[PDB]
Design a protein around this ligand. Sequence first.
Ligand SMILES: [Cl-]
Ligand SMILES: [Cl-]
Ligand SMILES: [Mg+2]
Ligand SMILES: [Mg+2]
Ligand SMILES: [Mg+2]
Length: 158
Amino acid sequence: TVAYIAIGSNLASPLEQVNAALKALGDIPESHILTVSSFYRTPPLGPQDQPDALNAAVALETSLAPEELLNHTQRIELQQGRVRKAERWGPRTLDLDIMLFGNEVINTERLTVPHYDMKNRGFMLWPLFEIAPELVFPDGEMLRQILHTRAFDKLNKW
Ligand SMILES: [Cl-]
Ligand SMILES: [Cl-]
Ligand SMILES: [Mg+2]
Ligand SMILES: [Mg+2]
Ligand SMILES: [Mg+2]
């Protein structure tokens, strides 16, 4: 099954963090990196001068069950990032989000797929559209259609 995973960083040299995360994802058992997007720059909201985030998307072919993949992504986040509790409400070292898992719809306390609110997040949809322009969501909505109907500015590359 192809899993689409979002990667975000805005601390401790994001280009390094995203590359470290790609290496870690690529190493997850019975999984293989199919496609990686370009790296996008996501400015902070608000006048406050916080660090920009680097955002990317990866297509990962995997034979793992969805919650098994989550076990690995959470492991990677905890080992590589999540240094301070404050990262929860602010800039963070590494954020790995499972956006989609084939055509699966999953609603558990651990795992919700498609990822919460992802259709309203340009920093997810742009890199996703780069790697899967013909993608259709589990509800039948085309990704391309979402980008023609929702108010997103085009994110610059990193
Ligand atoms: Cl850089
Ligand atoms: Cl959906
Ligand atoms: Mg391997
Ligand atoms: Mg996130
Ligand atoms: Mg997250």
